[PDB]
RNA sequence: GUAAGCAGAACUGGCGAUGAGGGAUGCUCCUAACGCUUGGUUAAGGUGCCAAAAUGCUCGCUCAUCAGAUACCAUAAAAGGUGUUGGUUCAUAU
RNA sequence: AAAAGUUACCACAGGGAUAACUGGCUUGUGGCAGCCAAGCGUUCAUAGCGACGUUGCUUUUUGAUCCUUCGAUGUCGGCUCUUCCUAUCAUUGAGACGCAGAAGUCUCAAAGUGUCGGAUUGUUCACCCGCCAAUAGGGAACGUGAGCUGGGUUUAGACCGUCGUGAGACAGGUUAGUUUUACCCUACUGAUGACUUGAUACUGCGACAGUAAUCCAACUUAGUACGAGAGGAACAGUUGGGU
RNA sequence: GUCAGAAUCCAUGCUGGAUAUGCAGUGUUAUUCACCGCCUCCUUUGUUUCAUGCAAUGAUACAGGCCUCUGGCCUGCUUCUCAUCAAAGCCCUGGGCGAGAAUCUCAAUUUCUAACAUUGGAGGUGAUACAUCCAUUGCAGACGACU
């Protein structure tokens, strides 16, 4: 029960790419508009 | 990337949170200075 | 019964009419370059041809469209398809014909060589005037071919390059045909009248 | 179909005309328009007594015969351009809300505020060869003046398009801006 | 029978028992029926390329923001159009 | 020939020469769209309608048929999951009105995005309670059982009613009743990997394929426009919410 | 002949690119007889979808163009160059010298082009490295792979 029941209709007599399957998750290359609050210094009181 | 911690800042938005003190989650990213080395030209061709 | 290479200028040319000539010559064993493929023409208006290219993008393998009809946006790559459309390309002989063909949207290399013209497959000849036509460079840049304005720049650059070559040659076409008129006098008067029978 | 057809155009005095190829420069005192006619199959050629411009087509079918008189009307407009200009007067209309209109008169652009009680501001830049005077002393009027017709009369029409009502019956709400009169300035 | 690649008859010819060339593809359509073959000529059907042969010659019509394109055959109608090309017949150039 | 029944306890030889599913031809029936103009529409055939007639389209209804399948293509419905169509319910941009405003009705480009929570029934349909921008209609072997479920239908047990002298029968009702196998090929999803004017290392280019955002509400605009009055908008701006 | 114009379309951005058996730039290129390059000179073989001059560089228009431009030209690469005199041979800096060539007996492909790779020689200049297993890691992981 941790799975899809119906992959596909009979025709096309072929599994379509749009249906979701089992496989890799994470390690995907991926954002935009994330605000910088503070630029700091390593050289105390940061 | 390092780890993330929350910070407190005063909102400046008339939202109901105007002039109030909001906690926010915040990632620290460690960035020691990047040393410049080379330089690369690029011709623009009809291929790319 | 044929030359080593035959470079085609493809401006003024109609797309199918060109391709059908070019196909049969590849089968006869002639090796061909096509050049300035962006300027090649098609009958019908721009809107009409783009509506026909949109019917082509609608086609795809529904299972996995990675696999299916590759929609090729570049003018060089578009002409290449319609030549392959006029060849039995699954058979081994058909494949050999494509191998001969080289298509470019003008590089280095063959600016230095002459470009010929197929006269039957030509717009000023064929399309009865008023009847609206469309350039392939426009049709391709409508459908996501990015490199319109480079092929503007590079051509406009190497036209100035070629007009510098022209005025050297045009000066030393004068210079030979000046020295011809001396040489035609000094050799004896029988053989001057001999050449004016046969044109030279 | 039809073997020959030729209408001729009278050139007025303070103008010159230079038809090389199909393309026709018209220089007068005020400015100058150039315009191309490389659609039409037609032989333009001016005369020995050079205040007349004949124009002819052989073998004209009845659709393409109708492009002989379209040439004449466009070239006639280019003459009364470079002499006299083309003023298009437009008048504002409204019921309740008085519509408030400003001008960067050299540029030129027309911001239109408070159209039908609205807060969206509506800038309309004109085409390169036309200006916009606010007409003094007559209340509520814009005068559009330039040499070309098609540049001016677009630029008039673009203002009409911008200031258009939606989502309401157009017969009651007549709030707009409309061309009053086509004319010239100089006479 | 509303009709059906539906059911039932009459005359002749086919398919079944039958390939070959054409109709892209098809048991029944077209040409034409077959011993192994060399040369010549046609049939149906075709001649831009796939494809052997015409980007042949000559005269009209058509521009389609879903043109059209070859019998059986792989659908289209009533009703419209000041889109264009001709015709028929009245009325003062329209 | 000299001759009654019954079998759901059933058996055998066969049959796609022959029914019950899909598919195919057909489209009466169902569904959808045109043409003409008697009248309706205070007045006015045509904003919106449209009798008496008449021309089409569709295969989402149901027949008609028996071409395929009887040495078996696993017969309803739900759940899950994907995609496609447009004959568009909502959302976008228009046009028309018997359009003052608000609210609508009609039509064009439109399938980009969206179409819900429950009570009763096995239901498909249906009918209610509610929400919502809207709760449009369909296809893909009446999608989808080596995907599940087994409530229904359709074995054997048993009950009632009607029919039969009886065994038994019922498109009459009722309860109890087994849902088998992938490790093969392809497809799809992920994983390594030989080789190409040398090896090996780093930085790149981007043909081509896939694509992503989309709806609502409040505050001001404004009790303004418009209206005899009741009622009552919109754009720009600000702030949130749903999926 | 133009113009405005949409929840549309195509780009852009985003994901892949062992989705083009695609393409570019840069680093280092085998401890000194030991292999290995690059550039000439000249020989062994073996590849080619295809050697016999398998030849020729303005850019446009077509109800117009080009210039050697007070003139001349267009109506086709239908042209314009190239092709000789002894051998696909031998001698003199690219042109030029001479010489009884046949009985190759009536034709037999006119065996030698081109670049690409390769076997072994001459002379000129050069170079003295990495990857995998292994152990370790855990930003990764069914096993490979990846860090």
Write the DSSP symbol of residue C39.
Answer: G
List beta partners, residue D8. Answer: D54
Kind and range of the H or E run holding D95: none
Count Cβ neighbours within 10 Å for each residue of A17-46 and write b for 16 or more, e otherwise.
eeeeeeeeeeeeeeeeeeeeeeeeeeeeee
**Between the CA of C87 and the C1' of F173, what is the distance in angstroms?**
74
Strand G nucleotides within a 7 Å radius of protein CB atoms: 1-4, 9-16, 19-20, 22-23, 25, 49-50, 54-65, 67-68, 76-77, 79-81, 140-141
CA separation for the pair B27, B2 (Å, rounded): 7
CB C88 within 8 A of CB C94: yes
Sequence-distant contacts of C129-133: CB under 8 A, at least 24 apart = C129/D41, C130/D39, C130/D41, C130/D64, C131/C43, C132/C44, C132/C45, C133/C41, C133/C42, C133/C43, C133/C44, C133/C45
C-alpha C58 chain-centroid distance: 29
3-state secondary structure D58-88: EEECCCHHHHHHHHHHHHHHHHHHHHHCEEE
Q: Are D133 and D64 in contact (CB under 8 A)?
A: no
Structural Rg of chain C based on CA atoms:
23
Q: Which stretch of DSSP H or E encloses residue C53?
A: helix C46-58
**% helix, strand, coil for chain A, step of 5:** 0, 0, 100
Q: Are D111 and D102 in contact (CB under 8 A)?
A: yes
Q: Which letter, b or e, does each residue of B15-45 get, where b requires 16 or more Cβ atoms within 10 Å of its Cβ?
A: eeeeeeeeeeeeeeeeeeeeeeeeeeeeeee
Positions on chain F within 7 A of a protein C-beta: 79-84, 94-97, 99-102, 140-141, 143-144, 147-148, 187-191, 203, 205-210, 221-222, 224-227, 233-236, 238-240
CB D117 within 8 A of CB D96: yes
Distance from CA of C64 to the nearest CA of A (A): 5
- Would you say the C-beta of C172 is within 7 Å of strand E? no
CA angle C63, C68, C74 (to 5 degrees): 145
* Cα angle D138-D143-D146, degrees, rounded to a multiple of 5: 155
Structural contact between residues D145 and D152, judged by C-beta atoms closer than 8 angstroms: yes
Contact B36, B26 (CB under 8 A): no
What is the CA angle A36-A40-A42, rounded to 5? Answer: 150
Q: Is the distance between the Cβ of D171 and the closest atom of strand F smaller than 7 Å?
A: yes
Let me know the angle formed at the C-alpha of D35 by D34 and D40, rounded to the nearest 5 degrees: 155
What does the DSSP 8-state code read for residue D180? E
Look at phi and psi of residue C176 and say left if phi exceeds 0, alpha if psi is from -120 to 50, else beta.
alpha
> What's the CA gap between C151 and B46, in Å, rounded?
7
Q: Do residues D89 and D66 touch, judged by C-beta distance below 8 A? A: no
Residue D125: CB atoms within 10 Å: 12
Measured between its terminal Cα atoms, the distance across chain D in Å is 43
Q: Which residues pair with B25 in a beta bridge?
A: B6
User: Are D114 and D140 within 8 A, CB to CB?
Assistant: no
Say what the resolution is, in angstroms.
3.2
Structure tokens at B4: 């993330």
Token pair in block for residue D31: 């400015």
Closest by CA to D82, choosing from D128, D28, D35, is: D28
Residue D144, helix vs strand vs coil: strand
Distance from CA of A21 to the nearest CA of B (A): 31
- Residues B21, A40: Cα–Cα separation, whole Å: 22
- What pairs with residue D86 in β-bridges? D146
User: Which helix (H) or strand (E) is D177 found in, with range?
Assistant: strand D176-182
Rounded CA gap, D77 and D16, in Å?
A: 14
Backbone angles phi, psi at D186, to 5 degrees: -80, 150
The contacts of residue C27 (CB under 8 Å, 6+ apart) are: C87, C93, C97
Q: How far is residue C188's CA from residue C191's CA, in Å, rounded to a whole number?
A: 6
Report the distance separating Cα D161 and Cα D144, nearest Å. 16
CA–CA dist A35, C83 (Å, integer): 54
Say which residue the tokens 């990015």 belong to. Answer: C146
Contact predicate D143/D87, CB 8 Å = yes
DSSP C167-195: HHHHHHHHHHHHHHHHHHHHS-HHHHHHH
Burial D20-35 (b: 16+ CB within 10 A, else e): eebebebebeeeebee
3-state helix, strand, coil in chain C (%, to 5): 55, 10, 35
- Closest CA–CA distance from residue B33 to any residue of chain A (Å): 11
Give the closest residue to A16 by CA, choosing from D92, C62, C173, D79.
C62
C147-150 long-range Cβ contacts below 8 angstroms, 24+ apart: C147/B46, C147/C74, C147/C105, C148/C38, C150/B44, C150/B45, C150/B46
Residue entry with tokens 């979701």 = A20
Burial D42-70 (b: 16+ CB within 10 A, else e): bebebeeeeeebebebeebeeebeebbee
Cα radius of gyration rounded to whole Å, chain D: 21
Give the Cβ contact number of residue C189 at 10 Å.
8
How many Å is the Cα radius of gyration of chain B?
22
Distance separating alpha carbons of residues D93 and D158, to the nearest angstrom: 16
Q: Could you tell me the strand order of the sheet in which D2-10 lies?
A: D2-10, D52-60, D43-46
Helices (H) and strands (E) in chain C, counts: 8, 5
- In SS3 terms, C54-93 reads as HHHHHCCCCCCCCCCCCCCCCHHHHHHHHHHCCCCCCCHH
Residue D31 CB partners (closer than 8 Å, separation 6+): D81, D82, D129, D147
Tokens of D158: 């673009």
Query: What is the CB neighbour count within 10 angstroms for residue D169?
Result: 7
Distances, alpha carbon C188 to alpha carbons C185, C192, C199, in Å: 7, 7, 17
Q: Is residue C115 within 8 Å of C45, Cβ to Cβ?
A: no
Q: Which long-range contacts (CB under 8 A, 24 or more apart) does B8-11 make?
A: B9/A37
Find all residues with CB under 8 Å of D22, minimum gap 6, and list them: D36, D37, D38, D40, D42, D44
Nucleic strand F under 7 Å from the C-beta of C60: yes
- Which nucleotide lies at the shortest CA–C1' distance from C132? E63
Q: What is the DSSP letter of C199?
A: T
CA distance C162 to D185: 51
The bridge status of strand D86-93 relative to strand D141-146 is antiparallel
**What residue has token string 């379509």?**
A16
Report the SS3 class of residue D116.
coil
Question: Long-range contacts: D58-63, Cβ < 8 Å, 24+?
Answer: D58/D3, D58/D4, D59/D1, D59/D2, D59/D3, D60/D1, D60/D2, D60/D5, D61/D1, D61/D2, D62/D1, D62/D2
Residue-wise over C60-81: b if at least 16 C-beta within 10 A, else e? Answer: eeebeeeeeeebebbbbbbbbe
Strands C31-35 and C5-9: parallel
Tokens coding D179: 């061309």
């Amino acid at each position: 029960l941790r799975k899809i029941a119906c992959i596909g209709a009979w025709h096309p007599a072929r599994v379509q790419f749009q249906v979701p399957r089992h496989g890799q998750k994470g390690y995907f290359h991926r954002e935009m508009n994330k605000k910088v609050y503070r630029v700091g210094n390593g050289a105390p009181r940061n | 990337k390092a780890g993330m911690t929350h910070v407190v800042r005063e909102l400046d938005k008339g939202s109901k949170l105007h002039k109030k003190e909001i906690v926010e989650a915040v990632t620290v990213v460690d960035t020691p200075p990047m040393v410049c080395v080379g330089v690369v030209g690029y011709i623009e061709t009809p291929r790319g | 019964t044929f030359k080593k290479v035959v470079v085609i200028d493809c401006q003024g040319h109609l797309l199918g009419r060109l391709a059908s000539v070019v196909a049969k010559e590849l089968l006869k064993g002639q090796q061909i370059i096509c050049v300035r493929c962006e300027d090649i023409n098609i009958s019908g208006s721009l809107h009409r041809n783009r509506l026909k290219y949109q019917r082509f993008l609608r086609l795809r393998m529904n299972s996995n469209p990675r696999r299916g009809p590759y929609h090729l946006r570049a003018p060089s790559r578009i002409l290449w398809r319609t030549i392959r459309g006029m060849l039995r390309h699954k058979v081994e002989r058909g494949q050999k014909a494509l191998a001969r063909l080289q298509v470019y949207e003008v590089p280095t290399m063959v600016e230095r060589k002459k470009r010929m013209v197929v006269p039957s497959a030509l717009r000023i000849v064929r399309l009865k005037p008023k009847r609206n036509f469309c350039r392939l460079g426009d049709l391709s840049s409508q459908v996501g071919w990015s490199h319109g304005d480079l092929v503007a720049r590079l051509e406009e650059k190497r036209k100035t390059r070629s007009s510098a070559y022209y005025q050297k040659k045009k000066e030393r076409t004068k210079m030979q045909t000046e020295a011809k008129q001396f040489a035609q006098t000094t050799l004896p008067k029988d053989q001057v009248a001999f050449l004016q029978q046969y044109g030279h | 179909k039809s073997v020959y057809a030729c209408e001729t155009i009278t050139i007025p005095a303070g103008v010159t005309v230079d038809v090389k190829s199909r393309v026709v420069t018209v220089k007068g005192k005020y400015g100058e328009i150039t315009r191309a006619f490389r659609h039409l199959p037609v032989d333009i050629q001016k005369t020995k007594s050079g205040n007349r411009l004949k124009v002819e087509m052989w073998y004209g079918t009845c659709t393409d015969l109708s492009c002989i008189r379209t040439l004449c009307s466009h070239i006639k407009n280019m003459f009364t351009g470079v002499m006299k200009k083309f003023q298009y007067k437009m008048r504002f209309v409204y019921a309740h809300f008085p519509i408030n209109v400003n001008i960067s008169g050299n540029g030129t652009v027309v911001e239109i505020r408070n159209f039908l009680g609205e807060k969206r501001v509506r800038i309309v830049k004109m085409l390169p060869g036309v200006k916009c005077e606010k007409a003094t002393n007559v209340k509520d009027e814009i005068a559009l003046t330039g040499t070309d017709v098609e540049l001016v009369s677009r630029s008039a029409a673009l203002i009409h398009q911008s200031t258009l009502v939606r989502r309401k019956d157009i017969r009651k709400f007549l709030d707009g801006i409309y061309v009053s009169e086509t004319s010239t300035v100089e006479q």
